[PDB]
Symmetry: C2
Subunit: 444 residues, 2 copies
């Protein structure tokens, strides 16, 4: 295998030109798709807001069309999934992850309109879910689509185009090119064996998708946090502690999402009508909460800058944290189309700010700013529950642009993962793919 | 499939022993890298005061400039040729091979050789970088604790050897992310599966970086300021620049390989002719390090100057050509020291050059040449070493201009694409191959 290596080394990085070109095609489509999906979610959330103004006097009526508008939208999403594409329920990352292991199918003819229009309903209703879920799975399916259409042959192309799709899908969801590519090579790709995924090609796709997002969303950032203060060396130990706190909570939260999947399955038993009804109740709860306490519902991207700036009270942070754990579990574990990835950014930000608040008062000698502990905690639930810290760190970095916190961010992230491992926790997506793969033999 | 279901449920459970030892490896590599850096600076400093001692007799002054660097160079070439030949050149290909289990990690020899050998060449003012020493040293450090504590298993041998090199690149640039990314994009075995725990590599990189911060806080290797943004209608200029790097990469790649050959003739493999040749080269840099400092040294000093556009077009052309010459002369000679960093200075200069032309051709874009410098900084890395994700993330960690992430990523891929399409190969992988081929012949 020495003489084999010398041959391989000299042939290293020579991706087939066909795959490189198709990577650009896949990337472009996924971008436009993720852009259209985002524009769609916004519109529906906006129509719902105008409807509440139409009835802005009769509070009980106003509380009703709030419920109903989101309820109907949720049901349309739950139905689209249960009836035409059950594999489009939940995040969609475990499914695309399975497709790379060649253990799950990519039924793009069904999932593309199901996820797009199903997620459009759940997110548009104001449920606590994220765009990654839809965009990643859609993007993966888009990639499979061009593979079929152009009939490209080979394991490399199937694995690559499927990978650049999900990568370009995560990138367009956050305007985070680096975080998308990193997600493929740290979490998405097959973890227990070799594969032929061209990073160069995944890159090309991510570029175009990100470029597409920039044609339609320039000048405004998803999260603006401003330039925060630096972090002294003697203050680092506070971040390792915060990571540990995330480290024991990650696995706990991980059980809850899994366990709430079970408990909610009993409510409908698998029945398409009980389920869609249950989803309308859940979706209606968020649309209601989306009026009476907007920080307890929605994507949560709005409270992140507020939390970081320290404009919340300690009681509000505890309220938001507990209330969002509840509505995150209720929305994701119910099987609605929509990721859990992004709402863990809001949960982490709040939990970090909370820590920073106590840290500020306990040590005035450190001249602390609670916003530094929020930025550190933003990608911490990602590291403790999803167990992909490198992605979470680079993601938060791309979204917050506070690089002088790179050490606290990294330290808080590893503390999350280490204690997540040491307390018996498992990666959420890998534990879900396993739960699904095990049932696909349980009923045999 | 049921195998997968078993594997998924057991995913990411790195042995606690490997995790703890990763922290140890990282700490040691950090202090080592810190000590190496403090050493190099000291020697560069003494040489500078020596030139002051004789700051009147210009020909004498030009001599003790030559001599001080010549002697220092020779001490490095000798330390390598006599005790550890595998410590010559970068050291990245060597550690890369060690991960393939196709090269040995002789830490009892390489550690003092690379440390004190690199101390000489770098301290003399030769055009090389600290990555080479620090990465190889770090990998050896990682091997050392593996042996000492007698940790068994392929995972531990592969991991500890990987966190070492990662922690070594990190401490050389104050770039933790770029270090970790280097292992998972270039260093690790590229054609088969391996058991390298990313979480563990991370832990090592932390401590090493932390160590660097205990001794180097408050000052950055490269300060460039906040540059202007890049409009969408301006991106096509970055793809063009990436193409220019794309065709030059492979060419420069042949040159380093070819000059390795041409310089081997001068000494034939003889330890005396070689060390003597090294003293002439090292002496040249110490001379150039006085008469035209931009043509010698690590090059980290001209990057902010270039980016701020304080250079003329002619000076940029001068610096570029003069540094192509002194980079090949220093690295292809076999001296201990990486080629990684001196390509940052080469790419920055080439980019600024491009940006200058862009500024005058299109005043409607309201350009700033410094944006094309930042884009070009990790472009030679992408064209010649062919590790663009690392290069992009490295420059990002060193320049802190994230609003240029699209131009940087585009210029990077334009480099790798055209590097591939013009028959270029990854330098380090082409060097490890050159070495593995002489071994079985």
């Amino acid at each position: 295998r020495r003489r084999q290596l010398i041959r391989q080394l000299l042939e290293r990085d020579k991706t087939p030109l066909a795959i490189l070109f198709m990577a650009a095609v896949v990337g472009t489509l996924v971008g436009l798709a993720a852009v259209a999906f985002d524009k769609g979610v916004a519109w529906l959330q906006n129509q719902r807001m105008g409807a509440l103004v139409h009835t802005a006097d009769n509070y009980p009526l106003l509380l009703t069309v709030a419920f109903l508008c989101s309820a109907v939208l949720a049901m349309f999403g739950y139905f689209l999934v249960r009836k035409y594409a059950p594999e489009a329920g939940g995040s969609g990352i475990p499914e695309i992850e399975g497709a790379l292991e060649d253990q799950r199918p990519v039924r793009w003819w069904r999932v593309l309109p199901v996820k797009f229009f199903g997620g459009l309903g759940t997110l548009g209703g104001g449920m606590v879910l994220g765009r990654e879920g839809p965009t990643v799975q859609i993007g993966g399916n888009i990639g499979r689509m061009v593979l079929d259409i152009f009939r490209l042959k080979g394991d490399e192309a199937r694995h690559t185009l499927l990978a650049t799709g999900a990568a370009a899908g995560l990138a367009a969801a956050f305007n985070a090119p680096l975080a998308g590519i990193l997600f493929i090579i740290e979490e998405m790709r097959p973890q227990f064996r070799y594969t032929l995924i061209s990073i160069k090609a995944v890159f090309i796709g991510v570029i175009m998708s990100t470029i597409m997002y920039r044609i339609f969303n320039h000048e405004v950032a998803l999260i603006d946090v401003g330039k925060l203060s630096d972090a002294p060396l003697n203050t680092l130990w506070l971040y390792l502690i915060l990571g540990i706190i995330f480290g024991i909570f990650g696995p706990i939260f991980n059980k809850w999402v899994l366990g709430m999947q079970d408990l909610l399955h009993r409510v409908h038993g698998g029945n398409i009508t009980k389920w869609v009804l249950m989803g309308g109740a859940i979706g209606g709860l968020c649309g209601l909460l989306g009026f009476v306490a907007p920080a307890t519902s929605g994507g949560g991207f709005n409270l992140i800058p507020i939390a970081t700036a320290g404009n919340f009270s300690m009681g509000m942070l505890v309220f938001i944290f507990v209330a969002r754990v509840i509505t995150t579990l209720l929305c994701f574990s119910s099987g609605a189309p929509g990721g859990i990835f992004a709402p863990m950014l809001a949960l982490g930000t709040v939990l970090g700010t909370a820590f920073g608040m106590v840290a500020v008062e306990l040590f005035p000698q450190y001249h602390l700013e609670a916003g530094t502990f929020a930025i550190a905690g933003m990608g911490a639930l990602l590291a403790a529950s999803i167990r992909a810290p490198l992605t979470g760190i680079i993601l938060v970095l791309e979204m917050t642009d506070n690089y002088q916190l790179i050490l606290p961010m990294i330290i808080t992230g590893l503390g999350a993962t280490l204690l997540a491992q040491f307390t018996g926790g498992k990666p959420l997506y890998s534990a879900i793919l396993a739960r699904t793969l095990a049932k696909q033999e349980a009923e045999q």
